[PDB]
A paper describes a structure:
The highly expressed D7 protein family of mosquito saliva has previously been shown to act as an anti-inflammatory mediator by binding host biogenic amines and cysteinyl leukotrienes (CysLTs). In this study we demonstrate that AnSt-D7L1, a two-domain member of this group from Anopheles stephensi, retains the CysLT binding function seen in the homolog AeD7 from Aedes aegypti but has lost the ability to bind biogenic amines. The crystal structure of AnSt-D7L1 contains two OBP-like domains and has a structure similar to AeD7.
The ligand-free form of the protein crystallized in the space group P212121 with one protein molecule in the asymmetric unit. The structure revealed two OBP domains with the N-terminal domain containing three disulfide bonds and the C-terminal domain containing two. Rather, this region forms a predominantly coil structure extending between Lys 169 and Ser 184 containing a β-turn between residues Trp 173 and Gly 176. Arg 177 in AnSt-D7L1 is equivalent to Arg 176 in AeD7 but is positioned such that its side chain partially occupies the same space as the ligand in the AeD7-norepinephrine complex. Along with other changes, including the presence of tryptophan rather than leucine at position 173 in AnSt-D7L1, this modification acts to further fill the space equivalent to the biogenic amine binding pocket of the AeD7 C-terminal domain. In the absence of ligands, the segment between Leu 291 and the C-terminus (Phe 297) extends away from the surface of the protein and forms a β-turn between Thr 293 and His 296.
Residue numbers in the entry: 2 to 297
Amino acid sequence: QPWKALDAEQALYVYKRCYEDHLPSGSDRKTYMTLWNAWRLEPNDAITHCYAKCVLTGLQIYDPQENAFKSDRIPVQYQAYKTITQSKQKEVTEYQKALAAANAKSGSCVDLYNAYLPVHNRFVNLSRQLYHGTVEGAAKIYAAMPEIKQKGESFHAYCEKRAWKGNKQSEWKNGRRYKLTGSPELKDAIDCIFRGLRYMDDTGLKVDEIVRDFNLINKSELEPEVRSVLASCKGSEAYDYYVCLVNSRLKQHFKNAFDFHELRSADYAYLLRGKVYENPEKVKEEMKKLNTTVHF
């Protein structure tokens, strides 16, 4: 239960979710995107302050419960990958010192941005090495970590391979299905998928993430129904919730939402490319493109 370092998939998840939730859309996007993609924490405004708090929280450099910067995680993040990044121990120590000096104050977006900015300006490139913030550096981690979910591979596919590893044939051998067989392998696959989609963690179900997936297939008016189905669900395991959703009158919409998130979990950039949901047939087409030489 010491804090554990984040691998490439975990960092890439944070970066794409913080773009989704903070990057402006439309005509003002290009200025923010060009600065943030270059790891420049500019301009100094509320949009950027909340983005910075999102990235610091996701990388677990800021802990909201303690309301503190966790400078002791910097050397832990470095130790886990140091044979791949080859980052310099002396610089890692300096980054640790600098972050230990910062004051989170109230923990508000602007307090975190103001405390972190001088540290960022000094250690930005090292931080991109440590937290898999470059495409080439993260690619080395994925090469070294064939066991984590790869770019282009959906969590539903990754979890299926792990769940039916044995002598039992996969239930999804001619394609993933919504059949509720109650098998140990299915319960295992569903837990792994719900955790990869951030529907669940050790603290329990995150209803707002399932609702988010309904919003993303243009069904936001069903939010109350989603909440109601999950609130009356008995059992606490991922498979229990999946069962309630699949048996409910939301079945087809949930299938569409979970299928779109399959696509989105294989290509973490999907919504940032400007792509949106269209219909189930288009999701299938886009999934087929992932299994081609160029992957799109």
